[PDB]
Amino acid sequence: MCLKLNLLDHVFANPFMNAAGVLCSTEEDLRCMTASSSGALVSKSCTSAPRDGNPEPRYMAFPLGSINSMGLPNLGFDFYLKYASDLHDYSKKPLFLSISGLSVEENVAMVRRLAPVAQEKGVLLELNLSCPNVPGKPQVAYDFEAMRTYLQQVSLAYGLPFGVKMPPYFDIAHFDTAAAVLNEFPLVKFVTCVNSVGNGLVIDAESESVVIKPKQGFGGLGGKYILPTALANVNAFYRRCPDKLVFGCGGVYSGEDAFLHILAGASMVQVGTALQEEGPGIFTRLEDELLEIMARKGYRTLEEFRGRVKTIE
Amino acid sequence: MCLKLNLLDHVFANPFMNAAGVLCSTEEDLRCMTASSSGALVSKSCTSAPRDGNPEPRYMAFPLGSINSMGLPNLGFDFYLKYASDLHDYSKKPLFLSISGLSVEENVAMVRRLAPVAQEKGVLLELNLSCPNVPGKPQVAYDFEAMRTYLQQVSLAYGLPFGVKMPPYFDIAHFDTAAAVLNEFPLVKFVTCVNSVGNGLVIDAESESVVIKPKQGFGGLGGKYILPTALANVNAFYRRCPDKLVFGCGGVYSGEDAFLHILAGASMVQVGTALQEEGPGIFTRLEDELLEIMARKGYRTLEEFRGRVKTIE
Ligand SMILES: Cc1cc2nc3c(=O)[nH]c(=O)nc-3n(C[C@H](O)[C@H](O)[C@H](O)COP(=O)(O)O)c2cc1C
Ligand SMILES: Cc1cc2nc3c(=O)[nH]c(=O)nc-3n(C[C@H](O)[C@H](O)[C@H](O)COP(=O)(O)O)c2cc1C
Ligand SMILES: O=C(O)c1[nH]c(=O)[nH]c(=O)c1CCc1ccc(F)c(F)c1
Ligand SMILES: O=C(O)c1[nH]c(=O)[nH]c(=O)c1CCc1ccc(F)c(F)c1
């Protein structure tokens, strides 16, 4: 009947939103997401200062998904904060703001500024743990001590409920260690699984060439390639973090794919590649498709099946 | 025009072989592989003792690839060593023997006994590092200290050229660290990239159930899902290990997929999922298709294009 839900002290029309980085960089983008049928929107991950990002071409898409090395292009934190404090129409849907500083200190400085606006307006923070490569050290969410420092510092500085955008993991021990880090932080109220599958390489057979210019063609994978990885991550953290929400991201092209995310444990479902390729019309199609699968199955609510994926024996 | 290779002091009719675990567990399997048009074969990764593996269903395939948690079912090392010593017809094609002991000591025990057979008959060792060690620790090749220890102990015990089967990596830092570990070992003459993309989760929408029984449905991914990941790892190790060969594995269904692996740096090209699904006739098709692409492009030999992927600007 209707897909409306309540999370994090906000009401949402439906569980769909963009994935950070897609259709969310400019004021134009944000207004378009706000005008869409999505249940929420999230802004492009920002730095304290504006960034141009990497040389083009830096994104390409294919029948099975996408590759990107954007380089964190963004208008800077002051723009996104202004959008949250003065321009967003909260009557339309909730807003999440994604932050991706290049150091702990930069994150801290952004979150301290965000906190009053969060209190006054209700904007929600998604903290992105992924970053450009620094030779000699791993990405922050793949360095569990660094992750723990980031979260300790942001938690102290911010003081309010927030979420974290996670890269995928591929090892059960890693799921156990990551979730145990996150569970140390009561203010981490949602976990978004997943960011792009890192450092894939698409090659064009005719030209014998990589398809993006930065990083010798290496870039993060999204889309169909990554749905089983995304589901695995959603479910692993759903199981491990019973006091948190999990937001699913990765490989959603249809209401059926959303249904699978929700079965695995997702509360919100984010759409990246498929949104980039189809445009914001996609949200009406996803809603219709999800309601049709629910009706066929007899489900009246998302809660009836969230996390209820069945195991064998 | 030809697909011939000469490497590791062996001659190969073409670069294609099975991926370890597919069509290689029983004498019947190995005889089938030998009868096929493949350029080589590898035996099922073995332990000291026979294993039944995990409960079924433990492998499933779909249009975009496969998922498995087999549990290392195998006939034991003594069977594979007998096949290599007594049964295999080396006039037909070269044989690789894959080992996947559950501790460094089990590996050392096997390679000590393999050595004289390697020396006399020419069987080639593939050591599987994308394998469990202590539960609650990451797989061996995700634990760089453990990986170093396995390589030091097996190199001392074996004393002959061998290769290693690697899981995929997703972070530049890990490519750099892993390749640096491998480059400490002069006896590691080939590197096979990649094993399955770990701990994915396939869910069936109609039944609302995972599709394999072990590990609550979590298992390693193969097939179309993983081709960009496999190409990235092939190229990353090809660039970082200039004194070693790289063998490609992951997402090969066509001659074009194989051509992309070879442009990335692959010497041998291994076929898992697609061989599991299509059967050994696949090798004639892959040879025909790769030759057709070479004819269109005017390439007469594999070396004309191996490693020659172009980057932008
Ligand atoms: C062009 C592009 C830019 C992105 N930028 C960001 C970003 O700024 N912050 C972030 O958290 N994830 C970013 N991502 C990752 C996506 O949010 C999402 O995690 C990933 O694309 C997987 O979802 P999908 O399979 O729906 O594409 C970006 C993805 C794309 C394709
Ligand atoms: C049923 C099955 C069993 C496998 N068993 C092994 C194994 O014993 N040893 C190993 O190194 N890799 C094993 N693998 C991984 C494959 O060798 C290969 O690395 C992976 O399937 C990716 O290649 P693909 O995309 O062609 O399937 C197995 C894969 C499958 C599908
Ligand atoms: O802006 C990006 O390149 C980007 N793309 C993603 O798919 N996810 C992200 O989180 C980001 C921003 C952070 C980031 C910036 C540069 C990278 F090389 C990287 F892998 C991640
Ligand atoms: O026999 C297996 O499950 C297997 N499957 C693969 O796709 N690759 C492998 O190397 C193996 C053997 C090692 C292994 C054994 C148990 C696991 F849970 C696991 F992920 C890997």
**Is B228 close to A167, i.e. CB distance below 8 A?**
no
The beta-carbon neighbor of B210 closest among A67, A203, A310 is: A310
Q: What are the helix (H) ranges across chain B? A: 27-35, 77-82, 104-121, 144-158, 172-183, 227-240, 255-264, 273-278, 282-297
Give B135's Cβ-side CA count (13 Å radius).
Answer: 0
Q: What is the CA radius of gyration of chain B?
A: 18
Sign, CA dihedral B57-A249-A305-A278, equals: negative
> How far is residue A148's CA from residue A137's CA, in Å, rounded to a whole number?
16
Domain boundary among B183, B207, B222: B222
| Burial of A6 from C-beta contacts in 10 A (0-12 / 13-18 / 19+) | exposed
Do residues A212 and A307 share a domain?
A: no
Give A30's Cβ-side CA count (13 Å radius).
Answer: 25
Domain boundary among B187, B222, B257: B222
Identity of residue A140: V
Q: What is the resolution of this structure in A?
A: 1.4
End-to-end CA distance of chain A: 33
**Is B67 close to A167, i.e. CB distance below 8 A?**
no
> How far is residue A258's CA from residue A249's CA, in Å, rounded to a whole number?
9
Nearest Cα residue to atom 19 of ligand 2: B195
Do residues B215 and B77 share a domain?
A: no
Do residues B208 and B301 share a domain?
A: no
Angle at the Cα of B60 from the Cα atoms of B58 and B66, rounded to 5 degrees: 115
**Is B171 close to A138, i.e. CB distance below 8 A?**
yes
> How far is residue B73's CA from residue B139's CA, in Å, rounded to a whole number?
18
Q: Pick the ligand that lies closest to the CA of residue B67.
A: 2
DSSP secondary structure code for residue B23 in this structure: S
Chain B residues in contact with A212 by the CB 8 A cut-off are: 312
Going by C-alpha positions, the residue among B233, B196, B193 that lies closest to residue B218 is: B196
Q: Which two tokens stand for residue A133?
A: 């490569």
Tell me which H or E stretch contains B222. strand B218-222
Do residues B76 and B129 share a domain?
A: yes
> How far is residue A193's CA from residue B270's CA, in Å, rounded to a whole number?
31
End-to-end CA distance of chain B: 31
| Burial of A307 from C-beta contacts in 10 A (0-12 / 13-18 / 19+) | middle
Chain A residues in contact with B64 by the CB 8 A cut-off are: 64, 224
Q: Which two tokens stand for residue B23?
A: 């069509």
Q: Which two tokens stand for residue B83?
A: 């096949």
For residues B15 and B38, the answer to whether their CB atoms sit within 8 Å is: no
Residue B120's CB is within 10 A of a number of other CB atoms, namely 10
Q: Which two tokens stand for residue B151?
A: 């390589």
DSSP secondary structure code for residue B84 in this structure: I
Closest ligand 3 atom to residue A139 Cα is: 20
Going by C-alpha positions, the residue among A169, A97, A162 that lies closest to residue A138 is: A169
Q: Which two tokens stand for residue A70?
A: 């954007």
> How far is residue B192's CA from residue B79's CA, in Å, rounded to a whole number?
24
Q: Which residues contact A32 (CB under 8 A, 6 or more apart)?
A: A23, A280
A131, A193, A241, A249: which one is catalytic?
Answer: A131
Phi-psi bin for A199: left (phi > 0), alpha (psi -120 to 50), beta? left
> How far is residue A233's CA from residue A248's CA, in Å, rounded to a whole number?
9
> How far is residue B289's CA from residue B287's CA, in Å, rounded to a whole number?
5
Q: What is the 3-state secondary structure (H, E, C) of B256-299?
A: HHHHHHHHHCCCCEEECHHHHHHCCCHHHHHHHHHHHHHHHHCC
Length of chain A in residues, anyone? 313
**Cross-strand pairs, A164:** A127, A191
Closest ligand 3 atom to residue A220 Cα is: 7
B24, B46, B131, B241: which one is catalytic?
Answer: B131
Do residues B19 and B63 share a domain?
A: no
> How far is residue B127's CA from residue B230's CA, in Å, rounded to a whole number?
18
Q: Which residue in A64, A172, A259 has the most chain B C-beta atoms within 10 A of its own C-beta, making it the best mutation to test that interface?
A: A172
A21 alpha carbon – ligand 1 mean position (Å): 5
Going by C-alpha positions, the residue among A64, A94, A216 that lies closest to residue B312 is: A216
Q: Which residues contact B28 (CB under 8 A, 6 or more apart)?
A: none
The beta-carbon neighbor of A309 closest among B138, B209, B309 is: B209
Going by C-alpha positions, the residue among B70, B68, B73 that lies closest to residue B52 is: B73
> How far is residue B70's CA from residue B52's CA, in Å, rounded to a whole number?
9
> Can you state the angle between helices B144-158 and B104-121, rounded to 10 degrees?
40
Q: Which residues line ligand 2 (CB under 6 A)?
A: B 19-22, 44-45, 59, 66, 68, 70, 98, 100, 128, 165, 195-196, 222-223, 226, 249-252, 271-274, 276
Domain boundary among B207, B222, B237: B222
Going by C-alpha positions, the residue among B151, B233, B146 that lies closest to residue B186 is: B151
Residue B25's CB is within 10 A of a number of other CB atoms, namely 21
Q: What is the CA radius of gyration of chain A?
A: 18
Cα dihedral A148/A218/B246/B50 (nearest 10): 50
B130 alpha carbon – ligand 4 mean position (Å): 7
CATH number at residue B8: 3.20.20.70
Going by C-alpha positions, the residue among A34, A35, A46 that lies closest to residue A94 is: A34
For residues A3 and A283, the answer to whether their CB atoms sit within 8 Å is: no
> How far is residue B89's CA from residue B106's CA, in Å, rounded to a whole number?
27
Q: A168 φ, ψ to 5°?
A: -70, 145
Going by C-alpha positions, the residue among B44, B51, B158 that lies closest to residue B109 is: B158
Q: Is the peptide bond between B123 and the residue preceding it cis, with omega within 30 degrees of 0?
A: no
> How far is residue B39's CA from residue B37's CA, in Å, rounded to a whole number?
6
> How far is residue A116's CA from residue A42's CA, in Å, rounded to a whole number?
18
Angle at the Cα of A12 from the Cα atoms of A9 and A15, rounded to 5 degrees: 120
Do residues B212 and B177 share a domain?
A: no
Give A271's Cβ-side CA count (13 Å radius).
Answer: 30
For residues B223 and B272, the answer to whether their CB atoms sit within 8 Å is: yes
Query: Is the minimum distance from the CB of A39 to ligand 1 under 6 angstroms?
Result: no
> Which residue of chain B has the CA closest to A224?
B225
Q: What is the 3-state secondary structure (H, E, C) of A48-60?
A: CCCECCCCCCCEE
| Burial of B312 from C-beta contacts in 10 A (0-12 / 13-18 / 19+) | middle
**Is B203 close to A231, i.e. CB distance below 8 A?**
yes
A122 alpha carbon – ligand 1 mean position (Å): 23
> How far is residue A135's CA from residue B171's CA, in Å, rounded to a whole number?
11
CATH number at residue B60: 2.30.26.10
Angle at the Cα of B7 from the Cα atoms of B6 and B11, rounded to 5 degrees: 40
Do residues B59 and B31 share a domain?
A: no
Q: Pocket of ligand 3, candidates A67, A69, A129, A137: which has the most ligand atoms within 8 Å of its Cβ, to mutate?
A: A69
Do residues B65 and B150 share a domain?
A: no
> Which residue of chain A has the CA closest to B135?
A173
A24 alpha carbon – ligand 3 mean position (Å): 14
Q: Is B46 a catalytic residue?
A: no
Do residues B182 and B82 share a domain?
A: yes
Q: Please state the domain count of chain B.
A: 2
Q: A284 φ, ψ to 5°?
A: -70, -40
Closest ligand 2 atom to residue B272 Cα is: 26
B288 alpha carbon – ligand 3 mean position (Å): 40
Q: Pocket of ligand 1, candidates A18, A22, A23: which has the most ligand atoms within 8 Å of its Cβ, to mutate?
A: A22
Going by C-alpha positions, the residue among B158, B113, B156, B106 that lies closest to residue B131 is: B106
> How far is residue B311's CA from residue B239's CA, in Å, rounded to a whole number?
13
Going by C-alpha positions, the residue among A236, A79, A90, A144 that lies closest to residue B142 is: A144
Do residues B46 and B174 share a domain?
A: yes
Chain B residues in contact with A146 by the CB 8 A cut-off are: none
What's the domain range around B151? 1-53+72-196+223-313
Going by C-alpha positions, the residue among A280, A262, A263, A201 that lies closest to residue A271 is: A280
Identity of residue B37: S
Q: Which two tokens stand for residue A27?
A: 């004021």
Experimental method: X-ray
**Cross-strand pairs, B247:** B192
Do residues A137 and A206 share a domain?
A: no
* Strand-strand pairing, A245-249 and A266-271: parallel
> Which residue of chain A has the CA closest to B233?
A200
Chain A residues in contact with B200 by the CB 8 A cut-off are: 228-229, 231-232
Do residues A97 and A227 share a domain?
A: yes
Exposure string over B278-298, b if 16+ CB within 10 A, otherwise e: eebebbeebbebbbebbeeee
For residues A168 and B170, the answer to whether their CB atoms sit within 8 Å is: yes
